[PDB]
Amino acid sequence: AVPAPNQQPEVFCNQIFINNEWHDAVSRKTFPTVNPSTGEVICQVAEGDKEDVDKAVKAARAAFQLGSPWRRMDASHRGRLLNRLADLIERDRTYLAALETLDNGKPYVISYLVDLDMVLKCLRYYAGWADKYHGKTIPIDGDFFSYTRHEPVGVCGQIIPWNFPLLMQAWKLGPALATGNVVVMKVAEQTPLTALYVANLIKEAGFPPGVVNIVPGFGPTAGAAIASHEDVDKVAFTGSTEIGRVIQVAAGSSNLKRVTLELGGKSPNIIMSDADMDWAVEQAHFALFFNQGQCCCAGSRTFVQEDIYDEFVERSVARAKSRVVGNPFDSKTEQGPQVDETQFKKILGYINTGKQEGAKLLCGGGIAADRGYFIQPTVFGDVQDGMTIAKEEIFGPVMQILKFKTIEEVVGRANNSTYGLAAAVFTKDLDKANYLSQALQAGTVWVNCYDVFGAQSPFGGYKMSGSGQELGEYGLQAYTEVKTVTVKVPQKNS
Amino acid sequence: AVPAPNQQPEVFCNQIFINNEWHDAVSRKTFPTVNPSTGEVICQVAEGDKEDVDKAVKAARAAFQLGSPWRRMDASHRGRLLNRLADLIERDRTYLAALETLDNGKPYVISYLVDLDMVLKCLRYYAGWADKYHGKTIPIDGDFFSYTRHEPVGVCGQIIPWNFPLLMQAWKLGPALATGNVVVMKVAEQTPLTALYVANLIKEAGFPPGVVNIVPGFGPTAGAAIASHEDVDKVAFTGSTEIGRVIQVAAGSSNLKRVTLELGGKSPNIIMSDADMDWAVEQAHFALFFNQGQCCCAGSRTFVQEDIYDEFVERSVARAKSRVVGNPFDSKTEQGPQVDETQFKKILGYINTGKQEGAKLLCGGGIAADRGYFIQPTVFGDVQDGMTIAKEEIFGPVMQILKFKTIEEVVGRANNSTYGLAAAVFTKDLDKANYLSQALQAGTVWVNCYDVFGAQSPFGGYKMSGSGQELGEYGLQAYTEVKTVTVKVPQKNS
Amino acid sequence: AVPAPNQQPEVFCNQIFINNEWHDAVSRKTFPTVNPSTGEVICQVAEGDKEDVDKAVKAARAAFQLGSPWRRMDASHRGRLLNRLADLIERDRTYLAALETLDNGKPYVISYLVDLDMVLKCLRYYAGWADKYHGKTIPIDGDFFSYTRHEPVGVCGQIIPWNFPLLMQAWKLGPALATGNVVVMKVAEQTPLTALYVANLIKEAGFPPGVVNIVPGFGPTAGAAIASHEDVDKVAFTGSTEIGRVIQVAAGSSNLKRVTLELGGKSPNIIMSDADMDWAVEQAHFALFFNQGQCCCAGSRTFVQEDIYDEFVERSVARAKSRVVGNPFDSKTEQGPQVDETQFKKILGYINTGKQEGAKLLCGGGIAADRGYFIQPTVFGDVQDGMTIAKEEIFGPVMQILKFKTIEEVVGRANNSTYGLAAAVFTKDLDKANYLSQALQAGTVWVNCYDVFGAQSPFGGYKMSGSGQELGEYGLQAYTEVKTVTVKVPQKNS
Amino acid sequence: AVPAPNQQPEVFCNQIFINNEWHDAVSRKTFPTVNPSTGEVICQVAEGDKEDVDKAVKAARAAFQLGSPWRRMDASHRGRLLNRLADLIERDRTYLAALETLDNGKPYVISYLVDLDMVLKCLRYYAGWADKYHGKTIPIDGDFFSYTRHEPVGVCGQIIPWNFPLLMQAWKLGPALATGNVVVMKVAEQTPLTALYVANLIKEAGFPPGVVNIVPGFGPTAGAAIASHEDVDKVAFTGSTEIGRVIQVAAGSSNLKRVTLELGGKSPNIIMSDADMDWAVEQAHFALFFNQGQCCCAGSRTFVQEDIYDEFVERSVARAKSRVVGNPFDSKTEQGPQVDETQFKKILGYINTGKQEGAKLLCGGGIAADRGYFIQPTVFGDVQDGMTIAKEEIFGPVMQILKFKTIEEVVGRANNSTYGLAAAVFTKDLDKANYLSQALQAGTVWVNCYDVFGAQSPFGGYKMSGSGQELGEYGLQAYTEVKTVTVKVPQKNS
Numbered sequence A, B, C, D: 001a002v003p004a005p006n007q008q009p010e011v012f013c014n015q016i017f018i019n020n021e022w023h024d025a026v027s028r029k030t031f032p033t034v035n036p037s038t039g040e041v042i043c044q045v046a047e048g049d050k051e052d053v054d055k056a057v058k059a060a061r062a063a064f065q066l067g068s069p070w071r072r073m074d075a076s077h078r079g080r081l082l083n084r085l086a087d088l089i090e091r092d093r094t095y096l097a098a099l100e101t102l103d104n105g106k107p108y109v110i111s112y113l114v115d116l117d118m119v120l121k122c123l124r125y126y127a128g129w130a131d132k133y134h135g136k137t138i139p140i141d142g143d144f145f146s147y148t149r150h151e152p153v154g155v156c157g158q159i160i161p162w163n164f165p166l167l168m169q170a171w172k173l174g175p176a177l178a179t180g181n182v183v184v185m186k187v188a189e190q191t192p193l194t195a196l197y198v199a200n201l202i203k204e205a206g207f208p209p210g211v212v213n214i215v216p217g218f219g220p221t222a223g224a225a226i227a228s229h230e231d232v233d234k235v236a237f238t239g240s241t242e243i244g245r246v247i248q249v250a251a252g253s254s255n256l257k258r259v260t261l262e263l264g265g266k267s268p269n270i271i272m273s274d275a276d277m278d279w280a281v282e283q284a285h286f287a288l289f290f291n292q293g294q295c296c297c298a299g300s301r302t303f304v305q306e307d308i309y310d311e312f313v314e315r316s317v318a319r320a321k322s323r324v325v326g327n328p329f330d331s332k333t334e335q336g337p338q339v340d341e342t343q344f345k346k347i348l349g350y351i352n353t354g355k356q357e358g359a360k361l362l363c364g365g366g367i368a369a370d371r372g373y374f375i376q377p378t379v380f381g382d383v384q385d386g387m388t389i390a391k392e393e394i395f396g397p398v399m400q401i402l403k404f405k406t407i408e409e410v411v412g413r414a415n416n417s418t419y420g421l422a423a424a425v426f427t428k429d430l431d432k433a434n435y436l437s438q439a440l441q442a443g444t445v446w447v448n449c450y451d452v453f454g455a456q457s458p459f460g461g462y463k464m465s466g467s468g469q470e471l472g473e474y475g476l477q478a479y480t481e482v483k484t485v486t487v488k489v490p491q492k493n494s
């Protein structure tokens, strides 16, 4: 049961958030954010740059000073605040889901039942961790008492993408705040609105001024200002592999701040001959097409055993042809438009490359509408490992189906990639499942399912898909500093 | 590759071990220990009673005094001592394996390749834990610094059975010593020899006097004296459910000492129709017959799906008929004699009980030799849940095979038992394996295998099979006391 | 800011709670609960006995069946339910604090700002643990995949005392429900009201019928029925050392159910010569007199260094003389009446004993009013270790002041006790603090403070003060069963 | 008791170690390693460069292949191998200590009693961790079974400095090998010998070929090749802050390999007026002068409270003047030469800068011998924060003594640094110790002691002193990859 959406939600926040106050950019400049379903400008938003980042960093540093309200606050109380924030987001769920759809393009039904639900679950999960991430008392040699304190890392710069605006903001705020850090967040230029509204809720929840600061703006300006800042202790980045390299170099060239990266992928989804056919087809469809194909862990290489290849393909094509593309506010819409014009064109370019290289176009392949950035659900069959569409992240509704024969063969082909974010295996056999989950070089391996995320389970990639993890207890590590205190004692006893 | 055994190993230790020295019982009484393969007395052993236990507890208490060598010793050094003990045991491996077989009856090849290997692995595993079981620093509300110290419980009474003499001794000493406790061990009257020789190695390894004290003797005397002692802080017991009750009652009626119990079982081994037949038959045989059937976790209820029942039974009977029973020092021997006359008679009684209640005797069913306590591998078919042989622990070479139709049905039947030590499932299906491992109410569930123990994995029972665990990190909990220290500080900061 | 109390709160719940419904006792019998401030009957409460306990256990067992709503519920949702209960309790905070004061006797200001605050913080802390108590994946030897599942123990019997009705209920429900167990709680006959009202909130919060069942009644009847029940998996008991022994014996004599105990103490509060005089005096007063002296961890052995003894005593006597005893609903009242006539007489008897044995009566020593169970704040000086009042738990407003000379002396005297629940050290010296905190044999050692509890920090005693812990992560151990699942795999790799 | 050293130990290993074999550099080029006590060449060593690093990486990658002996080896066995390596190093303890002193310059007595002892303790500690670093089973929402596997990161490049040759190699190999990774180590050009001999012991211990590969050579050649290698998964660097930046940039510019840095510091050692004078003076001396002042965590900023400044300085000067500088093989020698000519000159330059900026030269200040690189123990008084010697790491026998008045003041001055490796506090006061340990921004804070390291306690820096940690359980995090496996199950239950 989904409440009727306001297809034209009002925008209340569109400025820079610092010290719980709204500010215009120092330059007074603004940039437009577009509704991808219509191609029309929603509103103007303050264009933050270096000077604005500097103001935000100083406010974060001030809020992080020893003896400040945020530093003195009981850990259990930080949890109370995260829970309060969640309650506020839930109060405004119908509104936020509509705003998310308007700015991003994803179906309102999904924004409401999925994105918003996950935001709530993630913040409430981390609220619980606030007073539970213990340090240790260590039995070192000699007459000493030794223990560790798990202290906050400090001023954390967080740069997020546009595919899951509210969820990415929650994935970053949750562990950072639970562990007592202060934040300077740079939201994506394509989707800054929902995050800004949440900042209003952060203030309402009672978080001390300076604890969370949000600077909307571009990458080479605001984003780079955060990465190269001399007083930013750590930077968490989620986005393209290309910018990930830029971020790591900026950190090494500035103050050696700590860096964590969540990059893209070209995740293999392996269908063994003994899989449940109906289930495997629907899951492989979901694996690739979810969120207009704009998922880092999208199952973009669908490997199907030869004995079931023909039937699997035939059913996959039928499902892709039946997928409803249209107005994201319409309850029947399964697929909305791509996020912007740049992405829209990039996808069309990859489709053209697929055709040129000899992949078999089975359905779709072009624009789905005259207005907005809509693309038809596209399926390529007989894809080979050396093809561009089999190697590069398309980030669109373009499915690649490859044929294989043996389990030893598919392991090697699946692993022959510079990416290692996720992978999946569909089979009824115990031994095959264990053999594959162990052998696949990926941060997450799903068995008989796909895109199953939980605030409790970590999500991080291997190889060039990034470093470190998000969600779960592991997510707390990157936001913690370890201090060992070793005290001389009169006579140590067990 | 097994070294030739000395079939008549000399006995060097047969007294009470206290403060690293050998003592006769205060009464000067001795008891004979019998070789179960011949029915002849090996030698006499000091018969410890209450007064001897009192001496041992006082020695253990003195060695646990604050400032003592054992209390001041670095945790890493306790690990060094455990590793040294393991090296000494390995040096005398061939001798210990033969002495184990002489007093217990198990095949020398098994004593050498299994028992001794597992003793070495247990001690070395625990040596590694000595300096890694950390306490915690806790983010409590207010201006305080709060942390916990993981201290030793103190004087630990350990009462062990006779089925795995050396191994049970190691399972008890490993975690207790790794955490800095002191021990008063009461070994089984049927198999005291190997543990007394290890005491000699404990002294040789460098353990301070009083850290380990061993008192051979009977149960209602020496064992009860430990359970009811006013200065024993904890008692660990492994044996019959019946004596487990007496122990817990003795603890409650004396000084409320902490108690952990490892009792018996009637473990269900479930063979689904899609299982690997050959593997399942051999493993089911091993699951029940291992160690002359004297295993707490013996797969004494073999449930077989109806479609493969006939074939499974036919193959199980052939395997049981081919099992070689004889002199345990002979390399061809698969099964030695039962531990003693009492058990021998108990098993014969159970065999007769099975015949009387209508179970189908398929093979064996009688005495296998003139001398010693040898029983023929026995298999009962068409066993029903309400039969006594399907409910009570026989602890002998007597197999029960039951027929079932569905997975839902077998779950209920397998769980309808007052015991819950272990269980197993043989199937090739992923979902059946996961459905069963979750649904089975047992401490350990094996999938496509049986009796697979690792020093790293915990082992404990559910229901009336006991409480607490042994092996792994979990085995350290019962040997640790948690002290919280909460300090007022000028101003608490994250 | 404390809201004006309803000095005569209406009673809405006074029956047996089973399956989210109210029931009279099978016998139809009821017992009166008295207001300790007036000595008058508040109302009648159903008198649960064995047959009632039998009904509650059956309800709990049914609610725990595999596939039930409580068993299938996501761990995170158990957390949501606990947070909801907390919210309901906060909504009815004013009412609950008043009802607590009416049935128990403690000052309403304290019930509201201390007890209710702690109930909320306990339930909210444990709600956060629901989905965070992980099992392990273990690198066992050989070609196997081994892991542990932390499952609920099952039907947990919880018998609680009268000193902190609401808090004791929270301390028990929090960890038990966070881990998915079902409960059959037997509240104290002296204070059954507030717990019964919370049962109504449990139902309102949405917990499935049978998850929490409450049986008001007497000890030897309802309490013993739970301890000896054949289908209760675990029993947690908080109360007298005497009954603790009965519980452990009942468990061993019945079904070997798991047992944890929290008994009394005779906690030493050590004031060194360099301590802050003013702080130490107020804290020692608090340590002993808090909650009408009805605390298990009361600092009932105040050790004071000779050089500051005279001054400390002088100041301690003045503070005791100024302590306001009267109507608990009056904002000026610091000390309410003792819980009942039995306790009232026991305390007066101890005071007589103190005078007979030569302790120096410095103030108080008699009845404080002709109505209710009020006792004057009493202080005994020059107390010696061998005195009855220095060894036995008085549980009243009777303070013992002892003189000592050296640090080695005080450590031994503090440790020369059958109890070991808590201890405290007041000093400005680093080394003295560390020397004492390590040497004192107590579950909790406070430094420059007393009675500092946090939901995050564990609380459990040493020696005869109990076994196991409550609060913190450690509290989850006793409510968890560990299952090892070991699966044969094709080829294990790191 | 230290065995008499061989003052001219023979060199057995001086080549590149790959696949358990010795190779000359592909270019055939060699470089001389100098004895810092005489200034003479000890021997030539193969000069590894990019091509050699390429061979090492291929060897490491081949040893890491799924199905390889190293990958299939039981975790417990990796522990056995580390323990065996430790035994071999202990067998050759006397020789190794001598060789260390010959190549490095530190006193032989220290090499034997400190360095070798810590190497043994480090390796044995990590051997224990091999089969104890568990993954987790997670209670995620929905009908799924989710767990994590802690897998090795893979090919780890390790670049180490010259101050503690053997210990640095151990600190690196211990955690890397315990977690199943493979190594390509680049030892310091100034001290390559001991590491190369240990490589021989690694082969003897039984480690599979290619698990550990050592490439002696220069930094911009061999070092940079590892940091920029496309097939190196992680790089761990210990050294100058300047090269740390180079490493991080090379990583971001190459394959986004994971990076951990262990840089220098300017650690504050704070002496409060209530400190034990004699203890504080000796410890402050040790803090700074240890290992020729060549310690990253050297107490190079000795803050002394004004009331005790004069006496402290006076006593410090006396101690520095009596410190014996000479032949490291002579038992009376407390300080040997500096590692090389470059360091020797840099230190002399800093002493010159100290005199020029107005620091009061109290003793020493020049060359201590005609031969080798010996420098007189130098002490500067009245040092100000803005001085060069007060800000830059000198890495020599040059002590800075600063005066302060208040605790609040020293906290600010101590923290006003770009570094944050360590700090110390000398005081008898409990509150002062807790106030400072919390307030100091450093990875390690010692209280009434200095340079207290334990294999159990983690060691890592804050700010520009590095990221990540070494030693303890924390040291395993950087060498582990986390894989999440999420499996669809029929019906999840608690």
Ligand SMILES: NC(=O)c1ccc[n+]([C@@H]2O[C@H](COP(=O)([O-])OP(=O)(O)OC[C@H]3O[C@@H](n4cnc5c(N)ncnc54)[C@H](O)[C@@H]3O)[C@@H](O)[C@H]2O)c1
Residues within 6 Å of the ligand: B159, B160, B161, B162, B163, B186, B187, B188, B189, B217, B218, B219, B220, B221, B222, B223, B224, B227, B238, B239, B240, B241, B243, B244, B246, B247, B262, B263, B264, B295, B296, B343, B346, B393, B394, B395
């Ligand atoms: N859990 C097991 O691994 C295990 C082991 C051996 C036997 N059992 C079961 O026990 C049945 C009977 O064998 P048992 O008589 O040798 O077992 P048991 O319980 O009597 O003896 C085991 C240990 O406890 C000591 N003990 C005996 N009476 C005692 C007492 N009153 N107080 C304290 N300690 C006492 C024994 O001397 C021995 O050391 C077997 O047939 C089998 O079913 C179980």
Ligand SMILES: [Mg+2]
Residues within 6 Å of the ligand: A240, A243
């Ligand atoms: Mg870009």
Ligand SMILES: [Mg+2]
Residues within 6 Å of the ligand: B240, B243
């Ligand atoms: Mg018996």
Ligand SMILES: [Mg+2]
Residues within 6 Å of the ligand: C219, C240, C243
């Ligand atoms: Mg009573």
Ligand SMILES: [Mg+2]
Residues within 6 Å of the ligand: D240, D243
């Ligand atoms: Mg350099």
Ligand code: NA
Residues within 6 Å of the ligand: A033, A034, A035, A036, A102, A103, A104, A190, A191, A192
């Ligand atoms: Na937009």
Ligand code: NA
Residues within 6 Å of the ligand: B033, B034, B035, B036, B102, B103, B104, B190, B191
């Ligand atoms: Na025997």
Ligand code: NA
Residues within 6 Å of the ligand: C033, C034, C035, C036, C102, C103, C104, C190, C191
């Ligand atoms: Na009452």
Ligand code: NA
Residues within 6 Å of the ligand: D033, D034, D035, D036, D102, D103, D104, D190, D191, D339
């Ligand atoms: Na050198």
